[PDB]
Design a protein around this ligand. Structure first.
Ligand SMILES: [Ca+2]
Ligand SMILES: [Ca+2]
Length: 259
């Protein structure tokens, strides 16, 4: 079987190439949309007359149309103070209208004039998403931020292997996407109270308890093994190959049971 270990690592490299490709192709359908619509009349006019209900009506219906064309979860416009003033979900139970997101990194970074991206557990929706944001600029001034939130299903559904698993981990090794849903919002390895407090303060996963999956291993290695404490009652160990995707601040990992 060890006569098969290198071959498995080689196959892992191909799986990571194919999945990373799928991820990039899927995100590419949404990444440029905030810039595309950012200066559109409907968005700028709303930011300039945010308390004009007829204008907000026009802008809400436009964002709803855009959101349907791109098949995103939500597309919404935020003023320069962080308040959502128009949104594709204005007519849904999860309406973001009136909610303030100045505390979210995608708003903090984009109101400073740059494009930004982020992933999180949605605070109003309760749904995970990948977020792209872009500043709305008119007459050389930043007036607000436009955001597109993408549901993660098409990415997770692209993992079709039935003999291996994948997880996408953030910088604290918290599992944000996975082919095993039970591992979502758990860390790969134990975290200290201080680390858990930092995650909680960021609100990236809201108030989610972040339990530990308890694996041990070199989480910084491209090719490694994850094991449980010796003599533990379940030794579900794995051969694990990892591929960081810096732009996304996520590392993709493929896990194959060892033996
Ligand atoms: Ca435009
Ligand atoms: Ca084993």
């Amino acid at each position: 079987m060890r006569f098969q270990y290198q071959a498995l690592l080689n196959e892992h490299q191909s799986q990571l190439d194919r999945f990373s490709s799928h991820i990039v192709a899927t995100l590419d359908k949404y990444a440029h949309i905030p810039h595309l619509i950012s200066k559109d009349k409907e968005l700028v006019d709303a930011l300039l007359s945010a308390q004009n209900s007829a204008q907000i009506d026009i802008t809400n219906r436009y964002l709803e149309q855009v959101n349907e064309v791109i098949q995103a979860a939500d597309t919404y416009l935020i003023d320069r103070f962080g308040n959502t003033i128009a949104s594709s979900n204005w007519n849904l139970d999860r309406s973001f209208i009136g909610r303030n997101f100045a505390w979210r990194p995608y708003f903090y970074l984009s109101i400073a004039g740059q494009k930004s991206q982020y992933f999180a557990l949605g605070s109003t929706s309760g749904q995970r998403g990948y977020y792209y944001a872009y500043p709305v600029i008119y007459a050389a001034e930043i007036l607000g931020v436009i955001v597109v939130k993408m549901d993660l299903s098409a990415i997770e559904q692209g993992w079709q292997n039935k003999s291996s698993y994948f997880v996408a981990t953030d910088d604290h090794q918290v599992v944000f996407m996975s082919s095993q849903p039970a591992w979502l919002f758990h860390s790969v390895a134990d975290l200290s109270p201080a680390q858990l407090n930092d995650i909680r303060q960021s609100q990236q996963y809201l108030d989610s308890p972040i339990p530990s999956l308890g694996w041990q291993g070199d989480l910084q290695a491209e090719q490694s093994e994850w094991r449980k404490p010796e003599k533990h009652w379940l030794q579900d160990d794995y051969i694990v190959s990892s591929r960081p995707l810096p732009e996304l601040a996520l590392t993709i990992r493929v896990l194959s049971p060892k033996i």
